[PDB]
Design a protein around this ligand. Structure first.
Ligand SMILES: Cc1ccc(OCCn2c(SCCC(=O)O)nc3ccccc32)cc1
Ligand SMILES: C[C@]12CC[C@H]3[C@@H](CCC4=CC(=O)CC[C@@]43C)[C@@H]1CC[C@@H]2O
Length: 249
């Protein structure tokens, strides 16, 4: 279990949003805080990603690019896990200082997106996902969205991604005998992983739209979130970068 040792070792800790819970739950303040949270989580994603097995093998610009495309899905997925483990998915556990109850979901003007995240969160319970399955799935999300005309070194990305797939299939297989079980489970998890993309994409639209009208609406975007949402997000919205699904939509 060397591969799991590593995933378990490099797993980031609690990251706080910095939200002043004394302030009244407004849109402006809810969204600026989610944005600061994003920026803070980004630092930890960079650090986690570079320590993943095989990751520095990728061309250096490709390293930056896969992080910059996939962050939304990584963070959304980890947030659902957190939500599942700390609050049985009843609310959205963005951070220990930024838990969204129903009121906050309405106030953030994202209610239907949060509903979709809460569903994603509950799949962890419905499927009885293990911490091992979770870590390997999250690692595979790093490798699940790319430009349609390839990366700088695509051949290396393809072998790497294949190895992560092999690893998740292992994590399922150290466990079971009579083999419809292992087939159903791999099916279940590839389906779950696919389900992160449409949600990620809603949040891409929303944050983009938000950044456009941000000065009109008193929502702050920190430097890195501003740059990524203006330079890389639109490549996704314009279909120059697309998720890699397991099953056709
Ligand atoms: C099917 C297969 C292929 C190679 C292999 O070797 C182990 C190396 N390895 C890598 S390097 C990925 C390719 C690249 O950087 O261009 N990443 C791994 C992740 C998990 C386990 C081994 C990994 C093993 C099997
Ligand atoms: C992108 C965004 C800020 C960062 C948020 C994102 C919602 C999903 C999310 C979950 C996290 O746990 C980290 C912060 C992020 C990544 C937010 C939706 C709109 C807002 O602008």
């Amino acid at each position: 279990p060397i591969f799991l040792n590593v995933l378990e070792a490099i797993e980031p800790g609690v990251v706080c949003a910095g939200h002043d819970n004394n302030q009244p739950d407004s849109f402006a303040a809810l969204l600026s805080s989610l944005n600061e949270l994003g920026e803070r989580q980004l630092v930890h994603v960079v650090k986690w990603a570079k320590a993943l097995p095989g990751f520095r093998n990728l061309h250096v610009d490709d390293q930056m690019a896969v992080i910059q495309y996939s962050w939304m899905g990584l963070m959304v997925f980890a947030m659902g896990w957190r939500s599942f483990t700390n609050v049985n998915s009843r609310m959205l556990y963005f951070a220990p200082d930024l838990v969204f109850n129903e009121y906050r979901m309405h106030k953030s003007r994202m209610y239907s997106q949060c509903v979709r995240m809460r569903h994603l969160s509950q799949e962890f319970g419905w499927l009885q996902i293990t911490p091992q399955e979770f870590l390997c799935m999250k690692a595979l999300l790093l490798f699940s969205i790319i430009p349609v005309d390839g990366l700088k070194n695509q051949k290396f990305f393809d072998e790497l991604r294949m190895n992560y797939i092999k690893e998740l299939d292992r994590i399922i297989a150290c466990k079971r005998k009579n083999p419809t079980s292992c087939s159903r489970r791999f099916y279940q998890l590839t389906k779950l992983l696919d389900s992160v993309q449409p949600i990620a994409r809603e949040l891409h639209q929303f944050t983009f739209d938000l950044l456009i009208k941000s000065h009109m609406v008193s929502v702050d975007f920190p430097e890195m979130m501003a740059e990524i949402i203006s330079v890389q997000v639109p490549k996704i919205l314009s279909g120059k970068v697309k998720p890699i699904y397991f099953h056709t939509q």
